[PDB]
Amino acid sequence: GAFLDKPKMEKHNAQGQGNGLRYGLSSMQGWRVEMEDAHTAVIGLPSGLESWSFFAVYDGHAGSQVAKYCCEHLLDHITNNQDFKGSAGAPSVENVKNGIRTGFLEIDEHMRVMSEKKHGADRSGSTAVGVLISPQHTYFINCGDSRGLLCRNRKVHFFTQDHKPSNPLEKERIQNAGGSVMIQRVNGSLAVSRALGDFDYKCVHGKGPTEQLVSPEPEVHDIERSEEDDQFIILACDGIWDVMGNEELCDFVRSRLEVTDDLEKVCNEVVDTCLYKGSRDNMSVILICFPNAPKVSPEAVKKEAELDKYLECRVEEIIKGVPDLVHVMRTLASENIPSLPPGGELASKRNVIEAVYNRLNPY
Ligand SMILES: [Mn+2]
Ligand SMILES: [Mn+2]
Numbered sequence: 001g002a003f004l005d006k007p008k009m010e011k012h013n014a015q016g017q018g019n020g021l022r023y024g025l026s027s028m029q030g031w032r033v034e035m036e037d038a039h040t041a042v043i044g045l046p047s048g049l050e051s052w053s054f055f056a057v058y059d060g061h062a063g064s065q066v067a068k069y070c071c072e073h074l075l076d077h078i079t080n081n082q083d084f085k086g087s088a089g090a091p092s093v094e095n096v097k098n099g100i101r102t103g104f105l106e107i108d109e110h111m112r113v114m115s116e117k118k119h120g121a122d123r124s125g126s127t128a129v130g131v132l133i134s135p136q137h138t139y140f141i142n143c144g145d146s147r148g149l150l151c152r153n154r155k156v157h158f159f160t161q162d163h164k165p166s167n168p169l170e171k172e173r174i175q176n177a178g179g180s181v182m183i184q185r186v187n188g189s190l191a192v193s194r195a196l197g198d199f200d201y202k203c204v205h206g207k208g209p210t211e212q213l214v215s216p217e218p219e220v221h222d223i224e225r226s227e228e229d230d231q232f233i234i235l236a237c238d239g240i241w242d243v244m245g246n247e248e249l250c251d252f253v254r255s256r257l258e259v260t261d262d263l264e265k266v267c268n269e270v271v272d273t274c275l276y277k278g279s280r281d282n283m284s285v286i287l288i289c290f291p292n293a294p295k296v297s298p299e300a301v302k303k304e305a306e307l308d309k310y311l312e313c314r315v316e317e318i319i320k321g322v323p324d325l326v327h328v329m330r331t332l333a334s335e336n337i338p339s340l341p342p343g344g345e346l347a348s349k350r351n352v353i354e355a356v357y358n359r360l361n362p363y
Helices: 065-079 093-117 168-176 246-257 263-276 298-318 325-334 346-360
Strands: 012-018 021-028 037-045 049-061 128-133 137-143 147-152 155-159 219-224 230-236 283-289
Touching: 012 037, 012 263, 021 037, 021 263, 037 065, 037 283, 049 065, 049 230, 049 283, 065 093, 065 128, 093 128, 093 137, 093 219, 128 147, 128 230, 137 147, 147 246, 155 219, 155 246, 230 246, 246 263, 263 283, 263 346, 298 325, 298 346, 325 346
Parallel strands: none
Antiparallel strands: 012 021, 021 283, 037 049, 049 128, 128 137, 137 219, 147 155, 147 230, 230 283
16 A cells, blocks of 8 residues: 655645634645645635635545545535525524535535446545634534534544444444444445445435435534633644644644744644654644634743753763663653653654754764
8 A cells, every 4th residue: 555665754834824813834745656635725705705725635535536626616516505604694503504415415415426427446535634713613523533622711622533334423424324344444345434425325326415325425513712711723634633632732732832932833733742652644734723712921931942952962871882862762762751842742852853863873
């Protein structure tokens, strides 16, 4: 299968600000032979929704086609249907939720007809996770096993529930559609129960679009915004979540925000940390900060400089037969060094350690 001999570490970054928001994002191919993640990040939506913003991560499988079409058109499919448009002037909460549902079903069918029409060869699919942010609400959207969370008052206030085939209601739909869940996979193949695309899994006669083996139906949750307490939102594919839990990553991110306000850098730190914790998948993360996100702290910046210098000295000493980097890391780990970043741990300091190691053993 895939797997490069060495991971592609190149970061693709973007950032932006507006509507009281700031964001950064990072995508990295990592160990995989292809990059099949995509993302959307837009502040200010068309058609009278200038005060709105939209962010999403798409984890494509068996190709990038579906993920790429979604990252460019999911939003307009959501906002440009009668369900979303309700309505008086501003969409009600129901307009928004129904509009998102219709947008997923409609883009799915749209891609299906395009593929049938142009004799598409690909059999790809994609997850989608995102947030539609209005002046007063954050609407979390989830379809698949990517995941998003909201940090409010230093805690995980909300996170999306991953759609896995073994989940009781998912298993039930799958069985009723003539399939089975083998371990964690639909018919022993697909590890997600919900996705756009995967049209081979949506051919069950006598079942509606949301009753197929794989469903395009999103789960939507309206969270009323709190100007005082809302801190940040994280959206990421399973390349991140496979190796860091909700509270770990939330704690980690807060730790990094106390040290820098460069959101691209924070996202890069998350991605590298997850690579160093063993993630061999494509990785994409979007970090969206609200006005009361944690601020850079002079003491936090100092502590980090102290930790980095401490690590540099340890490496100098450990290096003295000249151990390889793997062995230096192993030694460092056995020392149970205090004050490492929460969640990120030693893996989150590997770039610092490797930089020193490289200076001392450049060949
Ligand atoms: Mn993928
Ligand atoms: Mn993935």
